[PDB]
Write a protein that binds this ligand. Structure first.
Ligand code: NAD
Ligand code: NAD
Ligand code: NAD
Ligand code: GTP
Ligand code: GTP
Ligand code: GTP
Ligand code: GTP
Ligand code: GTP
Ligand code: GTP
Ligand code: ATP
Ligand code: ATP
Ligand code: ATP
Ligand code: IMP
Ligand code: IMP
Ligand code: IMP
Lengths: 451, 451, 451
């Protein structure tokens, strides 16, 4: 076949469908290939898959799911800054380990107020001055509240709490694993971490979820990694603070055409106000474009212009690049400076994901391929997109594993035991390509139900 | 408008789409109308809706769901008798109240065996001679087993059980509400009901589910009502016993054409071997047909021939009846002997359900309208059906409430405050009808998403 | 429901799809219903089904098949009279019992001539003056000829015949059953029936075929009943003789509109030149039309005008009648004089056949429904038909039994144990009908594969 360099020296407009990969020597099982990949210069993920920040794709629910499956979710603009910050708060509060700021109450409150807290925040389990300085009086939970009816709005916590002397508690200074051990071998669900003066909390739901989700992408504090997209205008500097107060780990600068003085200024702003925050540059399709955002200190580069399944940018603008050529030509340069690429748009099926991953992309952000799932949101001003529709596609819980299995099988029967080794062979020529004619693409095709 | 008698005196082939109902005097809210209806002569349901016993509709999962929503599910033939009995067992074991036959173990077993029981039967909580005579040694549960790894298959229950002296227990003789009270005000999930000699169990999951499902159709023992369809041949008499050992409450005799000596013999067999079982006659579309099955002592009558969304019986047979005319003409006679009718086939939307309910049907069985949901099964020999397909329709949990809301709104704006009063007015003329021409049906029609 | 008289008193244009039959009391198995029916006043058939004489439906092969399945075949006009007579000869020679005119040879012939006879006539087994007066010299057959190669065209029958002294033979005067017994208990295939002077033949193939085809419609001489369609012009009187020399049993007078002086003249000609030949009148759709052909002495009446699946007669002519109304109104009168009716055109599926049989038709003739089968032929001048096409439909051997099964099931679940009792009930009101609206026909409908 043809090496990547020889394939892309043709100067043709090679998208993904314009070439294939010649298979290799299988030497391992379909479940042994490692999918480890980097979302950012200082964030590593188990699943290279990402969810694109669009109004009908990525909100708190999709971010929760995609962080549980080892990926990540980026939240969108079509909402108020307060709404975006609230969604990020939900994402980071889904699974938390140390519950350092419970929904605390004072013994003067009422079971009706406990029910109100259950509705508004979701938790029926809340410890009972009503601040993070109160020596425990007790705890309330579903098993203390549930049977009460017609009397909740008139019953003090006095009649239903658990007096602390009956509680099991732990000291302030024990590590998380030790607190988990004390919780596990206490046959109870909540272990308040208390100070020597008797003034955080760890739950069992977090451990059950750690069981249920082996690949969940968690931070150093056992909270789901979350990201957010911040614009380039002046107003964006209040949105950025309102959200970074929520602790977003990575931000993608949202812009159709990335290379500009404006995004460079926004970078120089972020990388000087919050030096520990990780940034992703704007959509570039050229090494000359990416040079500026790399010199600006950016840690990752979104790649793709006009190749979206919902994007008519080429039609309306006469600018862009073929998807696969852009991805290869940009990643071959970004790789020189440790900057992950993200192939955005153009991905219709798992073969496209595998092609993009082999072409240099350290991760892959997808849009419409993830839309219409049960977790997705919903049930002059020249335009650049179409208000399309997609058929129902089920839950991410069932869908993402299909993609992971497909990528692993592809790596198996292409001969790569890891997504790093795959790229190594590609950049060393041990992996081979061949172009496809329209008749060949016709040949390679055809009630289909993969699961 | 036209009374029901005057409408059906026309002798025309009036299906549901061939007439409408003139609205009346609204005097109440959309949520005040009562939907109480009888599935059988001695079974009353909260939701008149039923799920038809077909290979791609009704299995254990669908029956569980439809019993939770106040309806009922009938299990099909396309499987072994053992499979059908197992499915009925699952349905009756989903929510049980008194757990009279737990998955009991002996202290000589192993945590690996507890995990095996969790996988095969589903419960991780099981009490520990290992029979229903053992004085309790302890109990095991997720909070006793979960943290164990690489040692489960070599650890006796000695290291992990809860010694009984630490357990809370109750005496044998307390009523279910008292046992529930002791469980609720003990802050624990399992209360073994023990004899005075210290040799059943009630869980908290049943009470949580009773909270979550107010309208769940439960028997006198707090187990979901379940049904099964048994044929008419000689072999069916072993299937009938193998399933009635599971405690099916109601049986529908499955046959295209009901009136026959064969179904009469099967009736006379059931109603003399298991006199307490309730039977539903075969598909009849005529009062003369229904006379025989009524005199045979049957308690309910399935109605509908050739009107199924997947049925080509008229095309292949030249026999049947128009759906609405059959339903009215048969129910007007069955009503004379307290026998509920079931309108089967011909129902595409909620208006059809409302029409059938107004026409006399005490309940309504549906096929394709419920197919393709997340809960449904799957992902010469002259034929009478087609292997069709349906688009995804989501979960029953979300779908059935749409139907209940629609039927309630229909009753509201037709002026009926209950499904009994609706039928009373219909049979007394206070409810009025009018025929529709093809142009009128064209007029009354038209991206649609009801929820 | 509605009696036939009340249904057809509506004066509407009721085709088959415009009403249904209400079911009744099943009292027997699906294979117990008798399908005996009369093709003509003096021909009774086991299978009411007939094949219509059209260029693309009925030739020798189709007639052979449809006579084997208990029906009959009528041969067409689109060919020379010699061709039609030859086709009838093939039909009557397919299975023959007494082979009274074998392909006889003289011992001076050659094995090459035996092969030539095998190719031209089909039989490799022929007895060896070479006329029906020769005292047998021997017989030749595949087992005497097959191994010979490169020498067949130069070998006399002397080297290969079976000398008569080695043959088993029977006397002239034995009945067919006795000769068959002698053949069966002789362990050989051909038994020459010889005169006392030692000057017919029976094969084992005829007995094997009598085994394989229990319902085959055979004449009094064990030859397949065959028919032919003869025009009404002057030239047709030579075609009639050229074919009646072949022994056609029944003739259908082919004409779009039957009632005319020309067809009456043709009747009066046939019924006076060949008084033993049975005739079928021209297409009538009215009792006033049928009166003339009945008084002309006709023995059967083809019914149907403009209702063919390939006929545009109404469109081009403004004349005809609705199919079901015509069939009922004509058969109710013809029945008065023992004349079978034949419902032609309008039968799309088995339900149509059942409806027609219930309506009075003693038989039914089909066109396109039988076209495209493996047995069918092929692989100003105002027009009245269209050169349409049909999808492949398999062999008659498999397809006819499906129709028998369907008609029998229809009779079962409509409550008729015989096609005579069905008609008797219909004419006495024990069978009931109901009209269908367009919405009802829409309801009763829907990858379908009946076998
Ligand atoms: N990459 C793709 O495939 C693609 C294609 C089309 C659209 N999109 C997405 O749709 C959106 C379109 O981005 P956009 O750049 O058009 O929107 P934008 O909000 O960044 O800006 C819109 C217009 O204002 C300009 N602008 C940017 N920052 C400005 C500032 N601070 N002051 C003044 N003008 C400023 C832009 O150059 C552009 O002309 C983004 O979400 C983009 O990612 C993506
Ligand atoms: N009413 C409708 O809308 C409709 C239409 C078509 C099919 N169906 C369903 O499809 C199936 C078809 O039922 P069916 O009656 O054809 O199937 P079946 O298994 O009851 O019997 C098939 C055939 O055998 C006969 N039969 C019945 N019991 C028999 C016995 N004990 N011994 C011998 N023969 C016996 C029947 O009369 C029929 O001819 C059923 O599930 C029926 O409900 C329903
Ligand atoms: N039954 C149906 O639904 C239907 C409808 C249309 C056509 N067909 C078939 O197509 C063909 C059409 O028949 P057709 O009557 O048009 O053809 P035909 O050859 O019988 O006669 C054609 C014309 O000649 C006339 N004619 C017939 N015999 C005559 C005679 N002896 N002397 C003088 N004139 C004579 C007829 O009246 C007609 O005008 C037949 O095979 C008919 O059965 C059937
Ligand atoms: N309470 C609690 N403990 C956690 C959570 N996540 C990890 N831990 C604990 O932190 C330690 C990490 O163990 P791992 O097996 O590596 O856990 P993991 O979350 O699957 O993997 P990592 O994210 O790589 O740590 C153990 O003591 C875990 O019980 C969490 O969400 N809640
Ligand atoms: N109580 C509490 N839980 C929090 C908070 N923030 C995040 N969580 C997470 O809430 C998750 C579920 O804990 P709980 O709400 O107690 O769940 P539970 O044990 O099923 O309790 P109930 O909701 O009473 O049924 C855990 O993963 C916690 O990390 C917080 O402020 N308070
Ligand atoms: N443990 C347990 N108790 C139950 C169950 N169903 C009902 N009960 C108890 O039986 C009594 C019935 O109370 P209801 O409010 O009528 O319960 P429901 O199941 O919603 O309604 P019904 O089915 O009409 O009894 C109460 O004491 C319930 O707690 C069940 O599944 N499990
Ligand atoms: N233990 C037990 N439960 C049963 C049995 N049959 C039905 N159940 C039902 O199982 C349901 C769930 O109870 P549990 O198994 O305790 O569920 P849980 O409290 O979530 O406990 P885990 O399954 O250990 O997580 C209840 O509604 C019981 O009625 C049985 O034989 N044993
Ligand atoms: N020999 C012969 N058979 C005839 C004739 N007319 C009809 N048949 C039929 O031919 C059919 C087949 O008989 P055979 O020709 O002997 O068939 P076979 O036994 O397979 O013999 P081979 O053709 O030699 O293989 C029988 O059903 C006969 O009735 C005729 O003139 N001669
Ligand atoms: N050689 C020969 N004998 C036949 C044929 N048909 C019937 N026979 C004989 O004639 C007698 C009639 O027996 P049946 O059982 O009535 O035969 P069938 O053809 O199945 O039925 P029928 O047509 O009613 O005579 C028996 O002696 C048969 O062997 C035939 O095609 N060939
Ligand atoms: N540390 C503790 N020591 C003693 N009792 C406690 C402690 N924490 C909570 N409790 C009380 O005992 C129960 C401990 O179990 P847990 O906190 O998991 O309850 P829960 O949330 O109701 O369980 P579930 O949600 O699974 O029904 C609580 O319901 C509660 O009222
Ligand atoms: N009657 C009892 N008295 C004392 N301890 C009990 C009793 N029944 C069970 N236990 C032990 O204490 C716990 C009681 O809570 P429960 O039975 O609901 O646990 P669980 O099923 O693990 O809860 P969950 O499934 O909601 O996490 C069990 O985990 C168990 O091992
Ligand atoms: N009456 C007879 N007596 C003795 N031999 C006979 C007689 N008729 C035919 N034969 C010879 O013996 C064989 C008798 O069997 P039969 O006539 O069925 O042969 P066949 O047609 O070759 O059989 P098949 O076609 O099944 O292979 C013939 O092949 C033949 O040459
Ligand atoms: O509204 C729009 N107009 C044009 N391009 C868009 C729009 N919204 C998102 N995009 C881009 O198109 C991508 C979607 O690619 P997809 O995975 O093929 O759906 C996004 O990740 C953005 O880069
Ligand atoms: O396979 C089949 N052939 C013909 N009728 C069927 C078949 N299966 C089920 N039916 C009938 O058709 C009904 C389905 O009606 P639906 O609600 O309109 O789908 C069932 O309840 C049965 O009465
Ligand atoms: O060429 C034609 N033009 C008009 N009618 C025809 C023609 N050929 C046959 N017919 C009639 O149409 C019938 C076919 O009916 P079918 O079974 O519905 O195909 C035949 O039996 C004839 O009565």
């Amino acid at each position: 076949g043809l090496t990547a360099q020889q394939l892309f020296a043709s100067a043709d407009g090679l998208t993904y469908n314009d070439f294939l990969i010649l298979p290799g020597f299988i030497d391992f099982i379909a479940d042994e290939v490692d999918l480890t990949s980097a979302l950012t210069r200082k964030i590593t993920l188990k699943t290279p898959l990402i969810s694109s920040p669009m109004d009908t794709v990525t909100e708190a629910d999709m971010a929760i799911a995609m962080a549980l499956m080892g990926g990540i979710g980026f939240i969108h603009h079509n909402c108020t800054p307060e709404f975006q910050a609230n969604e990020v708060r939900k994402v980071k509060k889904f699974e938390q380990g140390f519950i350092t700021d419970p929904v605390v109450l004072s013994p003067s409150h009422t079971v009706g107020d406990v029910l109100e807290a259950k509705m508004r925040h979701g938790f029926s389990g809340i410890p009972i001055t009503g601040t993070m300085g109160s020596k425990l009086v007790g705890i309330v939970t579903s098993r203390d509240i549930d049977f009460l009816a017609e009397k909740d709005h008139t019953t003090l916590l006095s009649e239903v709490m658990t007096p602390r002397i009956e509680l099991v508690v732990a000291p302030a200074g024990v590590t998380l694993k030790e607190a988990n051990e004390i919780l596990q071998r206490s046959k109870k669900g909540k272990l308040p971490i208390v100070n020597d003066c008797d003034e955080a909390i760890i739950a069992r739901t977090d451990l059950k979820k750690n069981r249920d989700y082996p690949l969940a992408s968690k931070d150093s504090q056992k909270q789901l990694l979350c990201g957010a997209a911040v614009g380039t205008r002046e107003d964006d500097k209040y949105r950025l603070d309102l959200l970074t107060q929520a602790g977003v780990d990575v931000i993608v600068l949202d812009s159709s055409q990335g290379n500009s003085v404006y995004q460079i200024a926004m970078v120089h702003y972020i990388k000087q106000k919050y030096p520990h925050l990780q940034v992703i540059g704007g959509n570039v399709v050229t090494a000359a474009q990416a040079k500026n955002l790399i010199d600006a200190g950016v840690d990752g580069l979104r790649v793709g212009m006009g190749c979206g399944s919902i994007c008519i940018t080429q039609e309306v603008m006469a600018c862009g690049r073929p998807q696969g050529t852009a991805v290869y030509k940009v990643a071959e340069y970004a790789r020189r400076f440790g900057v992950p690429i993200i192939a955005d748009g153009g991905i219709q099926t798992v073969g496209h994901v595998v092609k993009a991953l082999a072409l240099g992309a350290s991760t892959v952000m997808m849009g419409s391929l993830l839309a219409a799932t049960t977790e997705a949101p919903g049930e002059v001003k020249i335009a650049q997109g179409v208000s399309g529709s997609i058929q129902d596609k089920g839950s991410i819980q069932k869908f993402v594993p299909y993609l992971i299995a497909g990528i692993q099988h592809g790596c198996q029967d292409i001969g790569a035991r890891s997504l790093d080794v795959l790229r190594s062979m590609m950049y060393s020529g041990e992996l081979k390509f061949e172009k496809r004619t329209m008749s060949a693409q016709i040949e390679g095709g055809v009630t289909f139900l993969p699961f």
